[PDB]
């Protein structure tokens, strides 16, 4: 229950070795503009803007491509594959390299990279070049910003009341709703309806669920902008690729926040994807061992990326082999591979503390690719808004 670990360590990706050559600069292309961007060939990821993506590139063609990007814009395209086998992709996200390190260990040139999602895009065309490396003709998808739902109606005499400044939080939210949505009486709907489409109210409702996962402040950790908050929450929601792609396709932060709240309330169980009916854990065991939330992307020693969701308890898992601290994503913990007891598919790893004074003494790191969010009782699947 108590976290006697340094929450800032997994975000640093300290397992990638010595300090990388950090970049300060930031690049952004105009909305709706068309850009040709290189795609990394073995990256099988669906990246969210604001999400950190660590990589280890081994192939000389991949290493060359990154050396060129580091000198130029530092931006590559991360395709959201609808069909991974036939490499089909209609959407994706740009990724900007913010840290890198080249190593000629043993006698093999390998490059470790830390990138971040920046802009969503629509794939216009894909062509593999005579070198074997492919380029994507892309169109930068704009982020739909809507004004206050009350802006259209709003009485000009109440415009000066739209800025709002120990005491009872429920009484505060009651006053917030009465003042922000007073002009709802000029329309066909009540104040309480407009609250369901209000960024600050939706963000406060999400914060109430995020507080159940992390014992950390809104003040620092969480962003203020609905766009950034909605993407930060999307990055740490353990959902399957079909749902994540639909979530990514949403252009409005209001619809994204509403959609996330609905997933967070409906999907309370997490099953094995191959079994579909083997419960591994529930949302009540989810907890944040990293500042970015319960789930983040990490890279293994062979470049394989795993979005790892940390939980207190997991069931229906077999442990393969003995624990190892080799390349551990949670410094101070040893990992043991964990499979589903029914289908034997890899679900994640069990992390066990190296010192007695550490807390928690054990937890599980589950790979998102192996999980399936489930809604118990007598209902199948749906993502409203």
């Amino acid at each position: 229950n108590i976290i006697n670990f340094d929450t800032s360590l997994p975000t640093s990706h300290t397992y990638l070795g010595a300090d990388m050559e950090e970049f300060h600069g930031r690049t952004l292309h105009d909305d709706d503009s068309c850009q040709v961007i290189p795609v990394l060939p073995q990256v099988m990821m669906i990246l969210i803007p604001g999400q950190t993506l660590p990589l280890q590139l081994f192939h000389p063609q991949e290493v060359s491509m990154v050396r060129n990007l580091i000198q130029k814009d530092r931006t590559f395209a991360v395709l959201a594959y609808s069909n991974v086998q036939e490499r089909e992709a209609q959407f994706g996200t740009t990724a900007e390299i913010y840290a890198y390190r080249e190593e000629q260990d043993f006698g093999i040139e390998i490059v470790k990279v830390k990138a971040i999602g920046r802009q969503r895009f629509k794939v216009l065309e894909l062509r593999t070049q005579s070198d074997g490396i492919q380029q994507a003709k892309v169109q930068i998808l704009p982020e739909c910003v809507l004004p206050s739902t009350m802006s259209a109606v709003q009485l000009e005499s109440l415009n000066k009341c739209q800025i709002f400044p120990d005491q009872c939080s429920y009484k505060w939210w009651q006053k917030y709703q009465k003042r922000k949505f007073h002009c709802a009486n000029l329309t066909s709907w009540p104040r309480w309806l407009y609250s369901l489409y209000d960024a600050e109210t939706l963000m406060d409702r999400i914060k109430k669920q995020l507080r159940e996962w992390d014992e950390n402040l809104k003040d620092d950790s969480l962003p203020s902008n609905p766009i950034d908050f909605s993407y930060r929450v999307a990055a740490c929601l353990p959902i399957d690729d079909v749902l994540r792609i639909q979530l990514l396709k949403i252009g409005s932060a209001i619809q994204r926040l509403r959609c996330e709240l609905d997933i967070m309330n409906k999907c309370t169980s997490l099953c094995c994807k191959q079994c579909q009916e083997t419960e591994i854990t529930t949302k009540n065991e989810i907890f944040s061992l990293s500042l970015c939330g319960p789930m983040a992307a990490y890279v293994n020693p062979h470049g394989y990326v795993h979005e790892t969701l940390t939980v207190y308890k997991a069931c229906n898992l077999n442990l393969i082999g003995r624990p190892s601290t080799e390349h551990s994503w949670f410094p101070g913990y040893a990992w043991t591979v964990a499979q589903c007891k029914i289908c034997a598919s890899h679900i994640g790893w069990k992390f066990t503390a190296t010192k007695k004074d550490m807390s928690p003494q054990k937890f599980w790191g589950l790979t998102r690719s192996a999980l399936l969010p489930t809604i118990p009782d007598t209902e199948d699947e749906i993502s409203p808004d």
């Binding site: 293994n300 080799e326 591979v337 289908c343 598919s345 890899h346 790893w349």
Partner: peptide, 28 residues
């Protein structure tokens, strides 16, 4: 201490090669 056959994706360590090859074929 045996287990000289590791899966480069999850890190599963196997004592025989026929055991690792069955495990790697379960991944995507």
């Amino acid at each position: 201490g045996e287990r000289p056959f590791h899966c480069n994706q999850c890190g599963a360590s196997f004592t025989q090669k026929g055991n690792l090859l069955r495990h790697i074929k379960l991944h995507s």
